Structures are given as structure tokens and as C-alpha cells.
């Protein structure tokens, strides 16, 4: 739920 990024 925490400490996860995101790339697009």
C-alpha cells in the first residue's frame, strides 16, 4: 500500500 512508484 506504500512505497511503490509508477511509470507510464
Amino acid at each position: 500500500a506504500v512505497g511503490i512508484g509508477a511509470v507510464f
Partner: antibody
Amino acid sequence: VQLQESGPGVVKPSETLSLTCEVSLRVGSYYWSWIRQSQGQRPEWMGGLYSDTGNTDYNPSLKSRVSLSRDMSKKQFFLNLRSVTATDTAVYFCVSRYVDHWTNRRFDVWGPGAQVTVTS
Amino acid sequence: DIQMTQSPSSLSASVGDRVTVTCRASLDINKDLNWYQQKPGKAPALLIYAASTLQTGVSSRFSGSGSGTQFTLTISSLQPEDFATYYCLQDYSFPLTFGGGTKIDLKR
């Protein structure tokens, strides 16, 4: 992606433990953490940060002693552990956690780990 | 902080067995639990995340279930390469915390 830890393998007690992580890399933000693990023990998450802001989250069992930062231009992110004792002897991993929302993959990248030993 | 209680500390199994590893959370952690395999000298490798999603490239005989506080990792047909230590990891809240570990070894 690939991560690689780097820094001294021996640190005198009371001194500061410093390590670098070389991050290999296309538009977004990563969560970079340091997770350490002493022999015969479970891993301990020390802290993490988001690469786009550098805002840190710290494990309360260390908070005063641990510092994290990153340099996007050099693709590095750093650990400083102040006033170490012999019980800070551990293997230190840098790990990257991020979801590719285009492909819906989860990605969980660990370095090979750097053993550091606190001793005089 | 939340803490996982892993069970059993070690578990004896033969090649081909169906084997179960369990993780208990002190608080409700929804389905924010991950399962790791670790071999000696190596970094832990992610097998299952979000309680039941199989990570890319992981063999399909690995499976996870549970929600709330009770979670289970099942190895359907244990192979020699499965002999390792396994950790659960909660990422429902900070700090991330790991279970105590389960070393699966060869039965004799």
C-alpha cells in the same frame, strides 16, 4: 533495470556507515529502499524514498541514525547510517519497487547486496 | 508497527509434496502481503504480491491466499530448487516488516 551497492565493507564502531546504489535505467517515479539482513535473521527495511521528490520514510527502530537521499542526474541513491555498533553488521540491499501502469507489471529489483562489518 | 509471525520456522518436505507456509499479521493488512524466496548468498526474489498475484517469471506451482491477518503460501509440487528460506512481507503500512522466515528442506 539493475541495482548495485557500493562502499566500504568495514566500518569502525561509532563511525558512519555510507553506501551508494548505482541504479540502471522511462517517465515516472520509483520507490528506492535500503533493506538489510544480518546472518541468521530476517530482512529489516531501513527506509525508502520516492525518486521524484526525495521524501523519505524511516523505520522507527533507526530514525535518528539513518539518512537516505538520491541524485537523479547520477542515477544514484545513498544510505548513511550514523554511530554504528557491531549489531549493524549486515548485508545491505538497495531495492526498487514500482508498477508499470501501461503493462500492469509490478517490478521488484534488488541489488546483489553489500556485506558491511562493524569492528575496530 | 505491524509484525508478521511466520510459521513454521522450518518445514520438512519431499520432492513432489504439496507444502504450506503461513504468515500472521498483528493488525489487519488487507491483501498487502508479499512472498519471497531466498537462497543463500542471494537477494530475496518476489514470488507473490498482493496476497495472490503471481510475479512474472515465477513458476505456477507457487500460489498465495488469505486476507486480513492470515495468509498462506502453497508450493503445489515441490522440486529440488524450492529448498530455500521463504519470507512474507507486509507493505500495508510503514515500516515494511518481514516475517521470521521458513526454511523448507529435504525430508529424511
